[PDB]
Amino acid sequence: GDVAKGKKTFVQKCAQCHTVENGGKHKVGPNLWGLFGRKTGQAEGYSYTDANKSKGIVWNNDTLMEYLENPKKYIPGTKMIFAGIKKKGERQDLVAYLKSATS
Ligand code: HEC
């Protein structure tokens, strides 16, 4: 996806609850550094719900694309209160940015 477009999407819809940089602070949600290739709920020092921690899947392009379309559907009981990015293209660009900004 388009990294530049994904960045603006992140700033507009995710930034209020997330940071992505290495050593980033946890806000409403956990810092996202190192997300790809890691199982759900593994950000150091963040208090996740049992649901996010128990999902047991590995975050990557395919799981992030599904999750971001409807967070609560993928992880019922999650405390991430966000409806999701409905457009696939917008979601793909966001994932592209996430991959670039989190490593
Ligand atoms: C606050 C109102 C939020 C907004 C807007 C977004 N997210 Fe979030 N996110 C939030 C919380 C409180 C949590 C933890 C949920 C829990 O049940 O513990 C999360 C979690 C995520 C995750 C999973 C992280 C992990 O498993 O380590 C991802 C990948 C994530 N959030 C992504 C994300 C994106 C890309 C957003 C914008 C579209 C976004 N979130 C917004 C709270 C909030």
From Swiss-Prot:
Signal peptide: none annotated. InterPro entries: Cyt_c-like_dom, Cyt_c-like_dom_sf, Cyt_c_1A/1B. Transmembrane segments: none annotated. It holds the Pfam family Cytochrom_C. Its main location: mitochondrion. It comes from the Eukaryota. The modification N-acetylglycine is found at G1. Electron carrier protein. The oxidized form of the cytochrome c heme group can accept an electron from the heme group of the cytochrome c1 subunit of cytochrome reductase. Cytochrome c then transfers this electron to the cytochrome oxidase complex, the final protein carrier in the mitochondrial electron-transport chain. This is Cytochrome c. It comes from Thunnus alalunga (Albacore). The gene is cyc.
